[PDB]
């Protein structure tokens, strides 16, 4: 069994490299962030451009949706995060306290909290309603490349160039687990599986690994793509077949069988590093986005 993702739309409008794309939880929208200091909102099913959201003083590396699809949070090199009302495009809050670029962000499922990771090597937990910093975790000794909540929001996973993956108790901020692996290659991305039992971690040696973090065992490895220099997003695709989806520095989208680890599809068409991919919450739809030579977002559709 293999998927047959085919290109349906190419979305243009960012004036610099795209950094991150994310589908809204209700499936209606795709949000994109860019080095051009902008967030853009597109219709998830027809690719129609909906609006531009601005206000950051420097580029944006990541963006994330609240559970009710009404809010966005963005992480910027201007050292702040911003919470945005999607319908009005207004900046509801500016979250200050990081001392270097903010690289990654995520709402918890409740969406009363935001987690952020920064080049200042820290992980911060913020109150959505007030915008105050609730906790600062000295999470790492190198820039933090990814942060993600589990499906109940009780845990946070973070990754860093220091080579570590760390699991944190959200309520207390205490580190529950540290994953070390061999010769400590930089960890460029990490996220929980939808069931919350496994973590997918990308390392800058052209490798993805699926880990059981409680036991500390790597259960799967996925290779064949190129990832040595960029923090590329990866995903579990669960709407049809159970795939692993990632971008690559060879300008392709890679799709593996989660269980067998075999490459089941390579999506051709981007003209620069595919820095970001995202999987639609209900349909077999992939969004991909690429760097300076390309600056576009592509939407792809599969029968399984």
């Amino acid at each position: 069994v293999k998927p047959n993702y085919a290109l349906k739309f190419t979305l243009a409008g960012h004036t610099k490299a795209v950094s991150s794309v994310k589908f809204s939880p209700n499936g209606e929208w795709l949000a994109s962030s860019s080095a051009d200091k902008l967030i853009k909102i597109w219709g998830a099913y027809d690719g129609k451009f909906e609006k531009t959201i601005s206000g950051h003083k420097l580029g944006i590396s990541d963006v994330a949706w609240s559970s009710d699809s009404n809010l966005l949070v963005s992480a910027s090199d201007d050292k702040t995060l911003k919470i945005w009302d999607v319908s009005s495009g207004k900046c509801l809050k500016t979250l200050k306290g990081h001392s270097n670029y903010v690289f990654c962000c995520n709402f918890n499922p409740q969406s009363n909290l935001i987690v952020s990771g920064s080049f200042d090597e820290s992980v911060r937990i913020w109150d959505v309603k007030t915008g105050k910093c609730l906790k600062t975790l000295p999470a790492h000794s190198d820039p933090v490349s990814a942060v993600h909540f589990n499906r109940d929001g009780s845990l946070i996973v973070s990754s860093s160039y220091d080579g570590l993956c760390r699991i944190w108790d959200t309520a207390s901020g205490q580190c529950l687990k540290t994953l070390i692996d061999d010769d400590n290659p930089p960890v460029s991305f990490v996220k929980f599986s939808p069931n919350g039992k496994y973590i997918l971690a990308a390392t800058l040696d052209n490798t993805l690994k699926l880990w059981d973090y409680s036991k500390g065992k790597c259960l799967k490895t996925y290779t064949g793509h190129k990832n040595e220099k960029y923090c590329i997003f990866a995903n579990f695709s669960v709407t049809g077949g159970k795939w692993i989806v990632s971008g690559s520095e060879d300008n392709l989208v890679y799709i593996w069988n989660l269980q067998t680890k075999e490459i089941v599809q390579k999506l051709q068409g981007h003209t620069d590093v595919v820095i970001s991919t995202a999987c639609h919450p209900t349909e077999n739809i992939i969004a991909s986005a690429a760097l300076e030579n390309d600056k576009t977002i592509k939407l792809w559709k599969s029968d399984c």
Partner: peptide, 4 residues
């Protein structure tokens, strides 16, 4: 920037 992630883009760099």
């Amino acid at each position: 920037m992630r883009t760099a």
